[PDB]
Amino acid sequence: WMPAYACQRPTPLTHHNTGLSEALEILAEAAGFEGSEGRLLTFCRAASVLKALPSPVTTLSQLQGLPHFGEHSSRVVQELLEHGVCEEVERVRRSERYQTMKLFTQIFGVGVKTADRWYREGLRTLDDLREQPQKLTQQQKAGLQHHQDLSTPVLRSDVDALQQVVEEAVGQALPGATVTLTGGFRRGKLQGHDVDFLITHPKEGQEAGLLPRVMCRLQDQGLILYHQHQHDAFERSFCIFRLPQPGSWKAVRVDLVVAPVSQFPFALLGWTGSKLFQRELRRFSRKEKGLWLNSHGLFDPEQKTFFQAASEEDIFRHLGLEYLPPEQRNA
Numbered sequence: 001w002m003p004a005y006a007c008q009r010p011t012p013l014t015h016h017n018t019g020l021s022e023a024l025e026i027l028a029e030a031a032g033f034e035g036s037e038g039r040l041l042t043f044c045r046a047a048s049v050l051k052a053l054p055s056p057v058t059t060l061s062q063l064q065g066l067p068h069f070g071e072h073s074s075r076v077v078q079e080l081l082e083h084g085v086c087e088e089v090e091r092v093r094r095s096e097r098y099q100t101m102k103l104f105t106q107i108f109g110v111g112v113k114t115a116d117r118w119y120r121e122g123l124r125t126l127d128d129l130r131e132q133p134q135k136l137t138q139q140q141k142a143g144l145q146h147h148q149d150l151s152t153p154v155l156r157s158d159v160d161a162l163q164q165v166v167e168e169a170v171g172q173a174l175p176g177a178t179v180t181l182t183g184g185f186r187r188g189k190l191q192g193h194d195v196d197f198l199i200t201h202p203k204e205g206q207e208a209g210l211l212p213r214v215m216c217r218l219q220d221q222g223l224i225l226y227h228q229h230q231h232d233a234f235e236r237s238f239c240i241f242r243l244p245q246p247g248s249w250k251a252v253r254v255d256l257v258v259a260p261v262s263q264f265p266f267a268l269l270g271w272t273g274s275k276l277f278q279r280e281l282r283r284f285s286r287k288e289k290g291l292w293l294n295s296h297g298l299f300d301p302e303q304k305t306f307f308q309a310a311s312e313e314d315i316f317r318h319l320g321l322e323y324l325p326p327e328q329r330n331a
């Protein structure tokens, strides 16, 4: 037996059902590309159940009353087990719409709405986009310029080098300020699409104006290819770093987020993910406890109060959930 919400169960980094979950996640992604948000969430939830299982699913018998495994997801798994392939899934991977939406949405600064608009307008390839520069934002132009490097998985070794230069710049701009690795890498992932960092200072308000200072230092070292500085939402910089390598260099996406220390635990929880884990945690908070959780705080809408947290553990405890360390949040 297994609980209904992903935030009530451990989901480790590696598991026994990668083929099956990958197939369901293709269907989820495709649904998202078509604006079918309900179906996206349903397939995502089913995939996450398989990630939480202790053993491989070898026979259809092994589906067992456990939640979020409706008729459609079950059929997909059945066809994979019986035939080694699911025709609905293969049709999706071969479809020009899916391939193009994946191509476009993977580019830095491009979401589903933009990608779909471009598709509707007859655009199909990266060259097609480069032929219409007036259709691109500066962020998207930078994403295109660096698309090969940004499609290359970011490695732990890259993260460690980036954390060093970010820590050096933060430390030099403001003694006392801290850098925390978040995102998938905090969850134990060996690879990723970007590197996420959360910056704060133990004295509330000393983080004001820190990020532009950190950026100036990084820029003067030749480490920045692109940055977009966004001033109650957190101050942040969406960056492409130029990471030096032996004999070469690689562009790497980095998100730098600044949070005041009072909000830090909520920010760390939100930015650590996984995306599904956080969605589930928020749905759980609202549906089961009547509280609204986000990356800034935990609000009781009836009492009009905010919960004071010193740590992620405090937040889990307040919501009546057993603590899950980040490596068990890989929903």
Ligand SMILES: Nc1nc2c(ncn2[C@@H]2O[C@H](COP(=O)(O)OP(=O)(O)OP(=O)(O)O)[C@@H](O)[C@H]2O)c(=O)[nH]1
Pocket: 182, 183, 184, 185, 189, 191, 192, 193, 194, 195, 196, 270, 271, 272, 273, 274, 275, 278, 295
């Ligand atoms: N509050 C908030 N959270 C965000 C935002 N963008 C991303 N996140 C969250 O930050 C976490 C990390 O996001 P990603 O970097 O896309 O995903 P990841 O788990 O790090 O996966 P890889 O980067 O591919 O390793 C996830 O929980 C996201 O939901 C944002 O603008 N605001």
Ligand SMILES: [Mn+2]
Pocket: 183, 184, 192, 193, 194, 195, 196
């Ligand atoms: Mn990330």
Ligand SMILES: [Mn+2]
Pocket: 183, 194, 195, 196, 255
């Ligand atoms: Mn990110």
